[PDB]
Symmetry: D2
Subunit: 243 residues, 4 copies
């Protein structure tokens, strides 16, 4: 497969419907060796089942709000993977009240803080901690959403976190690039669904399978000439207007 | 002038070199009535002197790091300007260690938090705090930089905060528009300089005059059709390549 | 006014509904001295009447499809304005059959040629023809539309010509900048309308007044730091999504 | 391979160094069945040798300036490929005088015409002619360059043609999307080379091999969720500033 011999860490697998599940699925098909992290114990047994299926034994706990937690997970990972080739950032979050209604009235200092810390910072937080472990030719991937670029109703402060994150992807790529590391993002279509379906050129919303293959590609040597790019896997929805 | 009839609040004056000082002058020259803010004891005496030269005596303190400092300042403002036409938000901050060297090695969870808190959240926190006081036809303005769109060396976490900020401009613009408020941004060229003067289409870096003139317009009714935009006042530096 | 001292050439007036008519008025209100152009016999009498109301009597013919029509018009201009401060290029054209239906089935090799020739090449062809006559501090302005950046139904080949046009603005801006000329563009909202009024942040389509006010500024020294930019005067319609 | 069973037409193979050569190379490796076109007789024997190597027998003549020529080639192609799955547009052109020196002085009406017709129009010209032959799941690919988005010295009018072409890619995708056709572009880094090498994050220019794999991916079902996107395969050069 095109990921044959790559050891990739996969974050964010919460369920079978998770974009991370669709992404691991594809990296696996393409011969990548996977490892997974889980936020808390609620999800341990589940993530362990998913990993077993995708052939890995590496299921490490990791809460991205704690620097120390991230450090710890990279120590355990290190016991089996002294060197690896990148990870998949598929973490995002904001307190619920934040995401409904008028942005200006919904947003709060604490809400803004959490949204940027979990959704934007965690990406560089992890990069920072596994930087010396990464093999040349490694690639880091994160997921963004059109809300970073356009004002979308209800997405509110999650839109700023994603803008921050897309900038993160350009600064990380410029910093890590020289040492053989590429970093990009995939702005996925919504996985309202009806409207998108009708107004999207391909006339259908993407699936974690569509996003999965783009993720696999981007993390593989096939995309070697690509770094710092936010690739839209939304079926073209953002390029059309007034359809 | 084209701002006569406008009561506008100007933040961020720290010196005669400050951008808001150039904005203040221009808004004053065009007929505006201004209110000023100073961050602390250190800057108070300096802001009061300029407000006097500009005919204003509305000089209030405001630490955007405190929601209470914000509410209280707008409460003192209501006592003199029950309603006004918008404010210029020319505040930005990142801890010393942040803007130096390899982005990834420099950035820290807290340097990140502070940079976003002060440079980005402070914008919406202020509109949040004064929404009711705004008149239809009101325009809010912020200041950003190219590092939001591109990875500029050493700008590091500030670039990410400028991205969150430009995203904030869109979401705020979209939410407030219905009540008669427009929200824009000026991505000003750096007021490196020699490289910019050599490669900028107009062949010179921009001045606080250039920036002030544009801010004055973005806050006047002359720009009634412009909302949610990030206007580049950098002499065309960003639209050139390998000059 | 902010344009007093400016001698500016205005093209594209065909009626009181025309965009250049709104631009002309505003540039006149601000102190500008204007020269006008009409495309043909049909429009002559109409342009001459407005020029009279605006205090001008410099009404010259110009078919941008002919390099000779251009040279000759600028030759008659030199006889009254040996030098001037820029011109507004508000010309655009695509053969009937083009802007109707499936883009791919509509577009023809010649509809393409004409659309690009008149809507895009005519911009640089005019600056080419009057370069020597320009004063430092001179600003050139064109009009574009969102269909350049996004695929709008029925806009078809015109979208492609607007893209070539916006690209023309950058290249012209970069080449001419050193001599004191700035070159910008206004991407105006459509002067469909009901959909736009409902989804536009300011909740109303923009007027030729809104557009004129912005053009007047983009052609004044107040915008000295803005060159090679495409300013969106569409009430923020383009920065919103799924409103 | 991921192109197993795809029949793709490849335009623009002029030499071993041609981006089209690097692209066919990769589609071949991935199991695609190729067919090639050649501009004129000068290149027939050569293109026939390249094709033989990549396992095809289909070497059709095609001059994109002639509608009739394009039609003819699709008739011959049709004899062997009644249905196929897309083509690779790797054609670009402008008269030489156009590409050196000051844009404004270099550009001409005829030069502009040719550059847009050959570089931009030909893409839709071909699409138009094979539209009923294309199989659902087909994909069309073209090559663009950063000159479309930034003002690059000497690229002059080629920059406008590419802007036109990038818009073409969005209008074609929106029109053909509903019938199961995706259309995208790859903005390739320069294949000055020294400067790019030093300022590009990956610290090296891309190769036709890097561009080749991205082309293969984009034309394969792996990229199914992608249409109307211009993907930058430039090693991140355009995302960084002032390195
Ligand atoms: N659903 C979509 O349409 C869509 C589209 C584009 C982008 N995105 C982004 O893709 C990413 C994946 O989203 P998803 O749709 O799979 O949703 P999800 O809820 O399945 O995954 C988000 C992940 O974030 C994790 N998480 C939250 N806080 C964490 C923390 N403190 N530490 C570690 N993990 C934490 C959760 O465990 C979860 O695994 C998200 O960031 C999302 O915004 C989603
Ligand atoms: N001058 C430039 O080159 C340039 C270029 C592009 C963008 N900018 C932006 O312009 C804005 C001002 O820059 P400048 O050069 O005029 O700055 P300056 O250093 O003269 O002023 C910065 C202001 O920010 C304020 N500030 C910081 N923390 C604050 C807080 N806690 N509470 C209230 N105020 C706070 C200070 O009081 C200060 O007056 C910033 O957002 C900056 O990022 C400046
Ligand atoms: N009104 C809108 O909704 C709108 C919105 C966005 C962009 N635009 C752009 O604004 C510009 C004018 O549009 P409008 O609605 O004011 O137009 P209008 O129809 O009132 O005027 C168009 C002008 O183009 C001129 N023209 C065409 N071919 C020409 C040629 N051969 N020589 C000289 N002149 C030529 C005509 O003389 C005419 O005056 C165009 O570029 C258009 O694409 C208009
Ligand atoms: N060289 C680069 O760095 C680079 C980077 C990005 C994009 N591009 C674009 O990639 C495409 C491929 O370029 P290349 O570098 O392989 O150069 P090339 O000269 O090898 O290929 C361009 C092709 O255009 C063809 N052509 C010209 N006129 C034609 C016509 N009338 N009909 C049919 N074919 C015609 C030539 O036969 C040639 O095969 C070009 O459009 C180029 O602008 C090049
Ligand atoms: C609690 C939590 O972990 N959060 C919030 C993270 C999170 C964010 C998204 C998202 O980024 N999306 C584009 C979907 C989405 C969420 C949403 C909320 C309001 C409006 C639109 C919305 N869209 C499209 C998707 C899944 C997800 N788990
Ligand atoms: C400590 C602090 O209060 N900060 C950071 C706020 C602040 C930021 C800027 C800025 O946003 N600019 C583009 C200049 C600038 C800063 C900078 C840092 C590193 C590299 C380039 C840089 N440029 C152009 C300018 C003035 C200023 N007071
Ligand atoms: C024949 C001709 O002289 N043409 C085309 C020039 C021309 C173009 C526009 C335009 O560029 N606009 C965005 C409106 C517009 C035209 C259009 C066509 C189809 C769909 C939407 C459309 N919109 C918004 C407006 C006026 C006008 N005179
Ligand atoms: C005659 C002909 O067939 N033409 C012009 C098409 C053509 C264009 C390009 C190109 O689009 N490039 C980015 C390279 C390139 C050409 C060029 C010219 C001037 C400046 C930079 C330049 N770059 C980067 C490359 C190859 C090529 N054959």
């Amino acid at each position: 497969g095109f990921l044959s011999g790559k050891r990739i860490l996969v974050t964010g697998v919460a369920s079978k419907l998770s974009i991370a599940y669709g992404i691991a699925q594809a990296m696996h098909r393409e011969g990548a060796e996977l490892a997974f992290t889980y936020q808390n114990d609620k999800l341990k047994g589940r993530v362990e089942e998913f990993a077993a299926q995708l052939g890995s034994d590496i299921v490490l706990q990791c809460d991205v709000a704690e620097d120390a937690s991230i450090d710890t997970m990279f120590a355990e990972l290190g016991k089996v993977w002294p060197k690896f080739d990148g990870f998949v950032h598929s973490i995002g979050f904001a307190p619920g009240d934040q995401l409904d209604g008028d942005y200006v009235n919904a947003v709060t200092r604490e809400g803004f803080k959490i949204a940027h810390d979990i959704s934007s910072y965690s990406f560089v937080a992890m990069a920072k901690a596994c930087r010396s472990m990464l093999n040349p030719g490694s690639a880091l991937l994160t997921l963004s959403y059109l809300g970073a670029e356009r004002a979308i109703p209800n997405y509110n402060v999650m839109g700023l976190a994603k803008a921050s994150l897309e900038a993160n992807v350009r600064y990380m790529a410029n910093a890590m690039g020289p040492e053989g590391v590429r970093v990009n993002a995939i702005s996925a279509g919504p996985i309202m669904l009806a409207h998108c379906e009708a107004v999207t050129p391909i006339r259908r919303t993407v699936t974690i399978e569509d996003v999965g293959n783009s993720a696999a590609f981007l993390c593989s040597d096939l995309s070697a000439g690509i770094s710092g790019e936010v690739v839209h896997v939304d079926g073209g929805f953002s390029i059309a207007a007034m359809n």
